[PDB]
Scaffold this active site. Structure first.
Site, PDB file in Angstrom:
ATOM      1  N   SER A  39       0.769  -1.239   0.000  1.00  0.00           N
ATOM      2  CA  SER A  39       0.000   0.000   0.000  1.00  0.00           C
ATOM      3  C   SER A  39       0.803   1.294   0.000  1.00  0.00           C
ATOM      4  O   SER A  39       0.182   2.348  -0.030  1.00  0.00           O
ATOM      5  CB  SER A  39      -0.990   0.059   1.182  1.00  0.00           C
ATOM      6  OG  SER A  39      -2.223  -0.615   0.922  1.00  0.00           O
ATOM      7  N   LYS A 201       2.354   7.511   4.189  1.00  0.00           N
ATOM      8  CA  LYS A 201       1.441   6.520   3.621  1.00  0.00           C
ATOM      9  C   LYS A 201       2.092   5.206   4.011  1.00  0.00           C
ATOM     10  O   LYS A 201       3.188   4.960   3.584  1.00  0.00           O
ATOM     11  CB  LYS A 201       1.398   6.500   2.102  1.00  0.00           C
ATOM     12  CG  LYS A 201       0.358   5.503   1.602  1.00  0.00           C
ATOM     13  CD  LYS A 201      -0.980   5.880   2.199  1.00  0.00           C
ATOM     14  CE  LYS A 201      -2.032   4.846   2.023  1.00  0.00           C
ATOM     15  NZ  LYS A 201      -1.794   3.616   2.785  1.00  0.00           N
ATOM     16  N   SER A 202       1.431   4.416   4.856  1.00  0.00           N
ATOM     17  CA  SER A 202       1.906   3.106   5.321  1.00  0.00           C
ATOM     18  C   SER A 202       1.571   1.917   4.409  1.00  0.00           C
ATOM     19  O   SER A 202       0.780   2.026   3.501  1.00  0.00           O
ATOM     20  CB  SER A 202       1.310   2.800   6.692  1.00  0.00           C
ATOM     21  OG  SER A 202      -0.077   3.049   6.677  1.00  0.00           O
ATOM     22  N   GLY A 203       2.169   0.770   4.681  1.00  0.00           N
ATOM     23  CA  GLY A 203       1.865  -0.376   3.866  1.00  0.00           C
ATOM     24  C   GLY A 203       2.112  -1.653   4.625  1.00  0.00           C
ATOM     25  O   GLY A 203       2.858  -1.675   5.595  1.00  0.00           O
TER      26      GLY A 203
END
Length: 257
Positions: A39, A201-203
């Site tokens: 992501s 923005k994490s993933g």
């Protein structure tokens, strides 16, 4: 601290690339090893669309139907049979990490094929978009699909967003979303000084405890950001990650700036 030390402490692999855009000073640790980006690629997809759709045109709508819905679409599953603006697609992808919005956004850009091309244009010959959500989430150390190195993603994020061809409004738009994203509070936002602003923005991929975070960090006093890319994974397919690992890697890395 030491990242080798953080590796041993967590029994995890760390990849870090950090670039202070004011000085051009880089910090690197396994910056050329491939990790599933997952992501975090939502931020790249969103920025590529924003390069081609002016802020005033974000109200433009797209039709969403049953065949668009993929797993974990907290916002978009409510739009089956309806229409949604490009602004709301971006807000859903970035804030809620909606897989359908993202897939729709990739489609609007032209598809993976067109995403892959704009990357080569930016000089990023490493980031390898191949599958859509959520099949991109199935990571295998034996495959290069949907992977990038920390140095490559990092540089791409800087030429797209930090110093790219985005307008003032679209760039503020993208960044506010990332500044107010409550999903990344246990990561980079957890290990940097409270003085700093973190737009991330994490993933997290399905396999090998693959946990990531990419952010623009604004030190109290500096208006130019520091691009920070932290990718991590473990040795076993079913390993769960510990968020404190990204938090602590961010803490140490900020000691260089």
């Amino acid at each position: 601290k030491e990242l080798n030390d953080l590796e041993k402490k967590y029994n995890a692999h760390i990849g870090v690339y950090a670039l202070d855009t004011k000085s051009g000073k880089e910090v690197k640790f396994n910056s050329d090893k491939r990790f599933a980006y997952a992501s975090t690629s939502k931020a790249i997809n969103s920025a590529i669309l924003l390069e081609q759709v002016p802020y005033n045109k974000l109200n433009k709508k797209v039709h969403i139907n049953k065949d668009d819905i993929v797993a974990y679409s907290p916002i978009l599953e409510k739009y089956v049979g309806k229409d949604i603006t490009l602004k709301a697609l971006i807000e859903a992808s970035m804030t809620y990490s909606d897989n359908t919005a993202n897939n729709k956004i990739i489609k609007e850009i032209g598809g993976i094929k067109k995403v892959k091309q704009r990357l080569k244009e930016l000089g990023d010959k490493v980031t390898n978009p191949v599958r859509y959500d959520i099949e991109l989430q199935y990571y295998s150390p034996k495959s290069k699909k949907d992977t990038s190195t920390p140095a490559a993603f990092g540089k791409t994020l800087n030429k797209l967003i930090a110093n790219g061809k985005l307008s003032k409004e679209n760039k503020k738009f993208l960044l506010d979303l990332m500044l107010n994203n409550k999903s990344g509070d246990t990561l980079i936002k957890d290990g940097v000084p409270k003085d700093y602003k973190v737009a991330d923005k994490s993933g997290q991929a399905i396999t090998y405890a693959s946990r990531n975070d990419v952010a623009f960090v604004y030190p109290k006093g500096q208006s130019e950001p520091i691009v920070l890319v932290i990718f991590t994974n473990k040795d076993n397919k079913s390993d769960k990650p510990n968020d404190k690992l990204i938090s602590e890697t961010a803490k140490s890395v900020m000691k260089e700036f």
